[PDB]
Amino acid sequence: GVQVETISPGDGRTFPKRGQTCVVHYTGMLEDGKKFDSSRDRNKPFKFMLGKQEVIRGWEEGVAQMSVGQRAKLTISPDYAYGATGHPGIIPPHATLVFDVELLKLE
Numbered sequence: 001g002v003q004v005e006t007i008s009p010g011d012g013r014t015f016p017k018r019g020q021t022c023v024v025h026y027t028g029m030l031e032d033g034k035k036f037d038s039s040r041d042r043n044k045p046f047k048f049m050l051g052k053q054e055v056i057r058g059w060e061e062g063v064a065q066m067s068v069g070q071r072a073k074l075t076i077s078p079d080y081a082y083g084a085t086g087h088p089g090i091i092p093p094h095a096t097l098v099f100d101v102e103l104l105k106l107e
């Protein structure tokens with residue numbers, strides 16, 4: 001599934017609810033540290049809404065455990081990521097993913 005390890009704590013009180021928009025910054029890496037994507041590189045947070053199949057499952061469950069202000073490492077098994085297909089040219093088949101995620105805001 002998904003493991004969450006805190007890099008810097010959030011407020012411990014403001015957690016994402018079903019149907020809220022999560023605003024984050026992330027960097028995604030393969031297990032060997034190779035970077036496959038980063039919102040920080042584009043100077044523009046990523047947004048998604050819980051409960052709408054908008055993100056891979058490990059994000060849905062992992063970001064849901066975070067509170068506003070938290071920065072965490074999410075380690076996601078391929079069943080909870082891109083599985084056998086991967087993402088063409090970017091994420092290989094059967095890849096465990098590591099994300100550095102910061103939950104900036106709920107809208």
Ligand SMILES: COc1ccc(CCCc2noc([C@@H]3CCCCN3S(=O)(=O)C3CCCCC3)n2)cc1OC
Nearest residue numbers: 028036037046053054055056057059081082087090091
């Ligand atoms: C619940 O499962 C599914 C539900 C929905 C889909 C559609 C795609 C949703 C999605 N798009 O991006 C992503 C992830 C996580 C959010 C940040 C962006 N990334 S990312 O890992 O960095 C990715 C890497 C390849 C290049 C594009 C960015 N999730 C797929 C699902 O499973 C395969």
